[PDB]
Write a protein that binds this DNA or RNA. Structure first.
Lengths: 156, 114, 66
RNA sequence: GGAGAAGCAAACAUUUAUUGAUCCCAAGAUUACCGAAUGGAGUAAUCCAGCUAGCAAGAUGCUAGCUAUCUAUUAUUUAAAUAAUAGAGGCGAUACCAGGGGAAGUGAACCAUCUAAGUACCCUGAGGAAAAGAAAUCAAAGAGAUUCCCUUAGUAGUGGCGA
RNA sequence: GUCUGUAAUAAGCAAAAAAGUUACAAAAUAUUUAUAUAGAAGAAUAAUCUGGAAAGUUUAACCAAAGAAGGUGAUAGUCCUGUAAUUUAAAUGUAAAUAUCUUUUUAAAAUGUUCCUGAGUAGGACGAGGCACGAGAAACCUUGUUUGAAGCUGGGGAGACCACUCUCCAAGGCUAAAUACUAGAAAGCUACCGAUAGAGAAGAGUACCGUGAGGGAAAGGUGAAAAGAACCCCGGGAGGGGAGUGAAAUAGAACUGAAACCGUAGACUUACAAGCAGUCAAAGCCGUAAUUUAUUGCGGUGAUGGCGUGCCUUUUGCAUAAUGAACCUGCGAGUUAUCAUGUCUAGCAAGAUUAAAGCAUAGAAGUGCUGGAGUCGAAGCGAAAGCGAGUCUUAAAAGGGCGAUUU
RNA sequence: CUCUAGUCUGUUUAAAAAGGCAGGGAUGAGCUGUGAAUAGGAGUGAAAGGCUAAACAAACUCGGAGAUAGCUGGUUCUCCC
RNA sequence: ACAUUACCGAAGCUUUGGAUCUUAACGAAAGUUAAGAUGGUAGGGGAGCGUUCUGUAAGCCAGAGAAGUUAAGCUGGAAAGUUUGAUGGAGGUAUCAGAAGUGAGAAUGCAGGUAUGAGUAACGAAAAAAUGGGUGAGAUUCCCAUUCGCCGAAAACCUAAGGUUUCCUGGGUAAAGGUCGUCUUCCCAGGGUUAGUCGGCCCCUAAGGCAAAGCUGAAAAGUGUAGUCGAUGGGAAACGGGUU
RNA sequence: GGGACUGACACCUGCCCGGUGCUAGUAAACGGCUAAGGUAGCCGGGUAAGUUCCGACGAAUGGUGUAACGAUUUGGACGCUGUCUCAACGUGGAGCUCGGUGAAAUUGAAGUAUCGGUGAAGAUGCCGAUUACUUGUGGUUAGACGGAAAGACCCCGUGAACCUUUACUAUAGCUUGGUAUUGAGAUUUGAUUAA
RNA sequence: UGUAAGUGUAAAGGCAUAAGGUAGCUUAACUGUAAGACUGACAAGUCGAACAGAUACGAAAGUAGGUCUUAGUGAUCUGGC
C-alpha cells in the first residue's frame, strides 16, 4: 500500500493466458511491496530495579575478585585539563593492553574532558555506571572517593 | 538487517553436481534434473547394498552346483552331508575353493558322500 | 493499551467463576410455560449448577479478565 | 575571500583576473510573454482597443502609464450611479485544524436493526497551530478556565441484549 | 451642577500604574559578542622492509576540549580538507530588555429604598441529530416545524418526575502556553538500503501507451592517473596481429565474470539393438601410485549381467492418459505492535511493581535517581441488601451448592 | 458514390472483422465534408439486452482497497523420540 | 493324490562391528554393563548446522595476496565443515551473547539471459522485367541509356484534412529497410518557405458557449435577460510569363 | 398535443363485468370463452418409386382473402451445365533444391518398438512374448486421452449481477387531513358548560 | 378351560398379590429438600431410600410428590399479571 503505483488490475482475470494478479505492487512481483518486512518499533524496556542493582553488585564483585586487573588510586585531579597527564597516569597503571575504565566519586569535569579522547578509555561516575563497560573492561581503575561513594550507594 | 548473501544455493548445487559427474545428457549439469536423478540414485544405492548379499549368495550357490555337476551328488544332498558330517565351511569359501584348488573341493565331496 | 482484549459481554452476563476454576451458571427451562413441568423438576431447575469441565477452557477464552 | 576564472565534465583557441576577478551572503536594479491575469476578447505564451506622453505619428506603426470584480468604510438620496482608500481572488503541505455534505466493500458466517463510521471522499474557511477556552460547570467529592497524557477501564451502560 | 452670588458636586491640571500575546492603538531608534543569513584561526611523523603505489610490516615518537566523518595510488590522530573548544556582521531578517512613545486611575473603605442585569430567549408539543447511551423509565445539549415564560420575593442543574437541600447565575465578545502537523531548511544519528535493493526515478514521471482523464519502465563500476594504443602489417572499414603506455591491455568503453547456452582438441565407448538413463557386479582400453614389474589400489571410460513405473500438489487409492514447471540465475510467504493465558529463565516476597512525568550529568533518541497515582494477591458467598471462614437456598449447620484449616 | 444476402480465400491471416467473385440502393426514409448539442443506474437506440473511443445485462480512470471468500494454489536447512 | 529325507528362499530370526534413547545395576560423579527400543503421514515435544548485523572487536588474520566463483583431496551420524592450487586485487573474521527482510524445486510466480521447435514456416498480393555502360574495394537490387511491361474518371496533376524538416546540396553505412546495397522518408553538416490582391487575422452573424442584473439551490452551482464570443457561411482588390 | 394498440387495401371483428385495472359502468382494457362455455371463418394429384410439398386454431396480443412487390422460406417444370457415374489434362501463386535474411505456439527430461495382459479401470516406460543394422529427407496424422481457451453444458458456494411479481422492507412521486403562512363580515348546523 | 378377557389413547414390555372390576372416604394432581445413580460431547432428561412442615386414607403398620410404565411437546431474549 505504500509503494508508488496504481491499484488497477494489470490484465483481465481470465483468457489472457497469464498468472492471475491483483495489483502491480504485489509482493511477489519485482519492485512490489514487501510482505512481513521490518517496521519501526520500540526496542527499549526497563528491567526491575532490584535485578539491575544485583547485576551491578555482581559485576563489581566479579571484577574486584582479580587483584591485578582491578586497581585503586588515591584521589587526584588533572587541574590543567590536558590529555598528556591523564594518559601518563593510565599508561603507568594499566597493563592489559585494552579497554580501561576509570571510576570517579563525583563529576570531575576536568578529568572527564581530559579523558574523553584517550584511545580505549571510559570514564564513569559512581552513580552512572554501565554494566557493559564494567563487564568488558580489562583494566578497572577506581578512586577511593569512588569506592566510598559506591559503598553507601549500593549498601542501601 | 537484510540478510541476503547468496553463498548458499550455489554451495548446495556445487556439491550435487560434484556427485553427479558422469550422468547422461542434461542430468549432469542442470540443477533440477541432477537433483532428481541423484536422489533416486541414493535410494537405489541403499536398496542395492542390501541386495548385494542376496546376489552374491546366489552366485556362490550356482558355482557350487556347477562344480558338483561331475559327480553324482546333487548339492542339496551335498549340503545335507556337509551339515551331517559337521563341516561348517562357508558358501563363499567353497565356491572360491572349487576354482582356486579343485582337488581339495573334490576331496571334500568324497568325504561328504559318506 | 492499544489493543486490550475485549470481553464477550453476552457471555459475562451468564457465566461466573468460582475460586478454583469451576464455572457457575443458571439452568435453563424455568423461564416460560411451567404448569406442565413437575414440581421436583422445577425445584431442581431453580437451584444453580456448575458446567461440565469440557467447556471451561473455551469460557476462559471468552472471559479474558473476569 | 585571496588566486585563478569563462555553469552543471573536459575538449578547441579566445579573453579577462593582483586596477582584487570568479564565487558566497545581504540589498538594489533589470525583470519579455502566458498564467489568480484584472481594458475587452481568446484555441494559455495573442489578436482588438479607449485615453495620455514621446517617436516627421500618418496611412490597423512603436514605446511608456491607466480603465476587471467583490466586500467593508463614506464623498452624495451607501439601493442606482460613479469617487475615495482599505481588505480579499489564486497557488502551496498527495500535512494538521474548524464548518457543511456523507457513502459503499465487511462483520453479524444470510440480511433489513446495528457495525464498519463521521471512515474514505467532496465542498466552504483561515491559522502557524487551529478549534475550544475563565462554569446558569463537574458532581455528592469539595473542588474551581480550556486543551493534551498516565490511570480509572474494557469499567459504568448501551446493543434483532445478536455481533 | 438650566444664569449670576453661597453650603454642595462634576469637567480639566500636580501625583502613579500599565500597554501592541487577550486585556487601547500607531510606531521609531539607540541598545543585547543575542540569534538567522556570507567567514576566520585551528594542534601533533621519521626511518626501514615488501610492493607499481604505504597510510601498511617493524622500530621509536608527538598531539589530544581535536582517536567525529571523508579524500589521499594498499588499511592515516599527527598528508589535505574538516572535527573539539572558541569565534566574522557592513547590510538584511527574527527576538527580548531599557527608556522614548501611547493609554489609563488623577479616590476608597463604607447601610437601606428604587432602576437594570442580555426575549420569540428559558421551557412545552411534534419530527431528527450529537452525548458511551438504538424510545428504553431516557435526563441533558444542539436543533427543524409550532407554541410560549419569569424579572433575585428570580431562574438553571443535581440521568423520568415531585418535594427538600446543595451548587451555579445563561441567552455579549476575546485569550498566549501545554497539544496536531513537516511538504520542506540546517545541523546529526541508525544491529536502515548498496543497483531485481533503496524514493517510481544514483539518469525521470523521462522514453513509451491511450482522444483525454490517466498509466508507466529498463539502463551504476576501465585504470592510481587517458597516461585513449605513436608507428607498422592484414582489411574498404570494423576488427585483429606487432610495437609502446600501464603493476596488469584473456585491464582497449570497461572491475570480480558463475550457471543456463554454444564450441574446439585429446582419451575411451558405440552402428543386432527395446536403458525413468540410475544403482549393484564386471572384462577390456587409457591415466596414475606402490609391490622389481604386471599383479593389487586410487581414477576416468565402460561391453555384458541383476534390480528399478521422474517429481510436485491433490485423493479411500496415481507411472498414471489428474494437476504444475523450457532451462538457469536473482527476487519471492506465520512478522510486528498490545491484551488474555500457559511454560521456561531472572529477582523479590504476604507482598510484588511503578505509568505518565520531573531533576541531574552528558549531547551520549542514554541510564542513575525522583515520582505509588493505579493494577494484581491477601476471603469468599449471595441477584442484591448484607453477612463473613463462612455464605446462600430455608423456620432449620437439616442436608447440600460454592468456599477453607493444609496459603 | 454508399451498403453486405450468397459463396470462397483467409483464420499462429496482408486486415483484432478484409479481400476475391456478386448483390441491393442509386432524386431520396439519399450519401457525405466541416462545426456544435445529449455522459454512466445516465445518454442514445426505424428496437437486435444494440452502441457510447477495437471489450457494455450498467463505460473508463483515480481513491476507499491489501474489499470479502466455508474455493483453488503456494508455503524454503537438518536430526532424534 | 498319498508317503520318506531335504534344500533353496525376505530388510524375519541368529551372529559380527558401530551409534542413540528408556529402564535397572555399578560408580563420588563422569561414565561403564545388563535388559529392550527405535517404519511412519497429520500432528506434538526436544536437540543442532548455516546466513546478515550488533557487543565482545581501537582484537585477530590479509597486498608477502581479503572476499567470491573454481580444480582436487579430506573430515563429521545429517544439516555441512576446512587444506592445497588456478583465478581474483581489496577487506573479512575466532570464542561468547543478542536481534531477523535468517535457508526455494514448483504458486498457468516476478525479472533477466539462453535453448527448443529450426535454419523449418514466412520474407506481405498472379502489373514483368532484361541487356549494356558509368560510379565504387565490393553491383541481378545504385546511377545513366536502350527495349519490354503496368495504371491511364489513375497507380496522373493541383489544393484540404494531418504530419513538421521528412524538402535541396554534400558526406557516410553502428543500427534500422523483412535480403544485398555505393542507395533510402537512415544518419551527420550546410542550405531552403519573401504577399495590399492567396488562405487567416478583421468587421458580421447560424447551431452553440459564457453571461452583469433578476430568479432558483447545503456548498460547489443550476437557469437565464441585456450583451459578448463562436464558420463548414456572408463581406475591398491580379493575371500572364520568366528566373533558383 | 401525448400515450397505447393494430398495420396498404377488401369482407368481418361475435359472447362474458365474476377477478384484476380505469372513472355501478367501461373488454378496439389486462383476461376468459361457471360472470359467460367460441359466433363468422379456417383420400386425391405429382414421381417407375415422395416421413417433403400441393389439393380435401380463432376473430384489433386480430380472423379470412388480395393486385403489385421481395439479395425471404418450400415444391415442381423447361433450358443449361464436370454437381454426380469419373476423372484426366493444362495454367497461375505456394509447396521441392540452393543462396541471403529469419519466427511462433509447445517444451520435467528421451540410448520413446509392437502384441497379448495387468493397473486411478484406454500403456512409449510394468510382466510375458515377438519384431527391429545406424542416422536423415520428402509425405500422411493413428497415438502421445495433441496444443490453444483455471468447460460455456451439469452441480456446488447461506457467490455476484440483472430482470419480474398480488415476496418482504423502505422511498421518489401522487393524494387526503391538520397547522403556520391566514384577515375582517353575515347566517344556522351542532356539541359542551351552567342558567 | 386358567388369562388367550380386560388395562382412556399406538404398540411393546408387564399386570392373579392382579396394575382388571366395584364401593366408601378423600385431594399427596403437596411445601422446603435430598444421600446415592442411570443415560449422556455439552446443554438436557430420568430414578431415588431418607429428613422437616402440613395433611388425605386406614384400627394401625404403611401408602400417597398424578394417570401400569414407555409419546401428548419448545431454549434464550422481549413483554404482561
Amino acid at each position: 500500500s505504500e509503494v508508488r503505483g496504481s491499484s488497477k488490475k494489470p490484465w483481465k482475470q481470465k483468457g489472457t493466458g497469464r498468472a492471475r494478479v491483483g495489483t502491480k505492487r504485489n509482493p511477489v512481483w519485482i519492485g512490489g511491496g514487501i510482505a512481513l518486512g521490518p517496521k519501526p518499533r520500540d526496542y527499549s524496556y526497563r528491567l526491575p530495579k532490584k535485578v539491575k542493582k544485583l547485576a551491578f553488585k555482581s559485576v563489581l564483585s566479579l571484577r574486584a575478585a582479580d587483584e591485578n586487573s582491578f586497581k585503586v588510586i588515591e584521589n587526584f585531579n588533572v587541574e590543567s585539563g590536558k590529555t598528556k597527564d591523564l594518559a601518563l597516569i593510565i599508561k603507568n597503571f594499566a597493563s592489559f593492553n585494552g579497554k580501561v575504565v576509570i571510576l570517579l566519586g563525583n563529576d570531575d569535569q576536568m578529568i572527564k574532558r581530559a579523558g574523553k579522547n584517550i584511545r580505549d578509555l571510559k570514564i564513569l561516575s559512581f552513580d552512572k555506571l554501565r554494566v557493559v563497560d564494567l563487564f568488558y573492561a580489562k583494566n578497572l581503575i577506581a578512586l577511593e572517593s569512588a569506592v566510598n561513594k559506591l559503598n553507601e550507594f549500593y549498601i542501601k | 538487517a537484510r540478510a541476503k548473501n547468496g553463498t548458499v544455493h550455489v554451495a548446495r548445487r556445487k556439491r550435487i553436481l560434484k556427485k553427479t559427474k558422469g550422468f547422461w545428457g542434461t542430468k549432469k549439469s542442470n540443477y533440477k534434473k541432477a537433483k532428481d536423478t541423484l536422489r533416486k540414485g541414493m535410494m537405489y544405492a541403499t536398496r542395492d547394498r542390501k541386495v548385494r548379499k542376496r546376489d552374491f549368495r546366489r552366485l556362490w550357490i550356482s558355482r557350487i552346483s556347477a562344480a558338483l555337476s561331475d559327480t553324482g551328488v546333487t548339492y542339496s544332498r551335498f549340503i545335507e552331508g556337509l551339515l551331517k558330517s559337521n563341516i561348517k565351511i562357508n558358501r563363499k569359501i567353497l565356491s572360491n575353493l572349487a576354482i582356486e584348488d579343485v582337488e581339495a573341493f573334490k576331496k571334500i565331496v568324497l568325504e561328504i558322500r559318506r | 493499551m492499544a489493543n486490550k482484549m475485549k470481553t464477550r459481554k453476552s457471555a459475562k452476563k451468564r457465566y461466573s467463576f468460582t475460586v478454583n476454576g469451576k464455572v457457575k451458571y443458571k439452568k435453563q427451562n424455568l423461564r416460560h410455560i411451567l404448569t406442565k413441568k413437575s414440581s421436583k423438576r422445577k425445584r431442581n431447575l431453580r437451584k444453580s449448577g456448575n458446567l461440565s469441565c469440557f467447556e471451561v477452557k473455551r469460557i476462559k477464552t471468552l472471559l479474558p479478565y473476569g
